[PDB]
Amino acid sequence: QSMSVKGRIYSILKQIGSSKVFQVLNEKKQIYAIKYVNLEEADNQTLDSYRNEIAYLNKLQQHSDKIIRLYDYEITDQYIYMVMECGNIDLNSWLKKKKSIDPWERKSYWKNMLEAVHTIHQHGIVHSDLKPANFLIVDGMLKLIDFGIANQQVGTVNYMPPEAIKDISPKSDVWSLGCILYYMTYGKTPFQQIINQISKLHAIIDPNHEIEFPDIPEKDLQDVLKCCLKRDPKQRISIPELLAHPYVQIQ
Ligand SMILES: c1cc2cnc3sccc3c2cn1
């Protein structure tokens, strides 16, 4: 099985993920990821969302290694081919498969998530739909897969900020990152216990609904969670503030 992106031939190895993602090999026998997108039944608002996300991904590549590498692309009126770097596994399936997560790898992953989200924020981008499925493990390093600009773990309200439920600033991405770190800390998201979707949304917003923060041996890690998971965006810690917190800095 084969395919041609900008005159270069790529051999398919396996499918990873309208859109199909594949693991491929080039002529020089190097491993890549090819995202295929079918534009056939797509509107102008959809096309603009797609061209906007590609342009942001192409630009933000130069600013951080914690953003997925985009090597090349081919765009027509019928399709998109994106030659990207191949990750090992996404953060979600890595966590789902793992029972207990190492405190050193968790601190390391946190640092990477802050670096990536901070970059998009410096360029005016608020992701708003952050989940572990949005991050990629590549050579013991987390990488942000996308920016939330392009149309369409999906649907999930577990990482949703209170401000998003009511209706959006960088503080929204802070709430979501805090939910991801909470999962890597406690083994569940803060509201995971609630099956009923409405009853879950009714708890995320309600301030009288106290989020449990059980006593862990990492006092700094407990403080981060308590700082991220504050219902009032005004009272929530910022990304530049998180990057200076003792949890990220102290050895
Ligand atoms: C674009 C590029 C990717 C590269 N590597 C991997 S490994 C598991 C998912 C993915 C992936 C998804 N979208």
From Swiss-Prot:
Keywords: Acetylation, ATP-binding, Kinase, Nucleotide-binding, Phosphoprotein, Serine/threonine-protein kinase, Transferase, Tyrosine-protein kinase. ATP binds at I16, G17, S18, S19, K20, V21, K35. Changing D146A: Loss of kinase activity. GO terms for molecular function: ATP binding; identical protein binding; kinetochore binding; protein serine kinase activity; protein serine/threonine kinase activity; protein serine/threonine/tyrosine kinase activity; protein tyrosine kinase activity. One of its GO terms (cellular component) is cytoplasm. It comes from the Eukaryota. The keyword Transferase applies. Present in rapidly proliferating cell lines. GO terms for biological process: chromosome segregation; female meiosis chromosome segregation; meiotic spindle assembly checkpoint signaling; mitotic spindle assembly checkpoint signaling; mitotic spindle organization; positive regulation of cell population proliferation; positive regulation of SMAD protein signal transduction; protein localization to kinetochore. The active site is at D129 (proton acceptor). Changing T156A: Loss of kinase activity. Residues 10-248 form the Protein kinase domain. Belongs to the protein kinase superfamily. Ser/Thr protein kinase family. Interacts with TPR; the interactions occurs in a microtubule-independent manner. Interacts with MAD1L1 and MAD2L1. Involved in mitotic spindle assembly checkpoint signaling, a process that delays anaphase until chromosomes are bioriented on the spindle, and in the repair of incorrect mitotic kinetochore-spindle microtubule attachments. Phosphorylates MAD1L1 to promote the mitotic spindle assembly checkpoint. Phosphorylates CDCA8/Borealin leading to enhanced AURKB activity at the kinetochore. Phosphorylates SKA3 at 'Ser-34' leading to dissociation of the SKA complex from microtubules and destabilization of microtubule-kinetochore attachments. Phosphorylates KNL1, KNTC1 and autophosphorylates. This is Dual specificity protein kinase TTK. It comes from Homo sapiens.
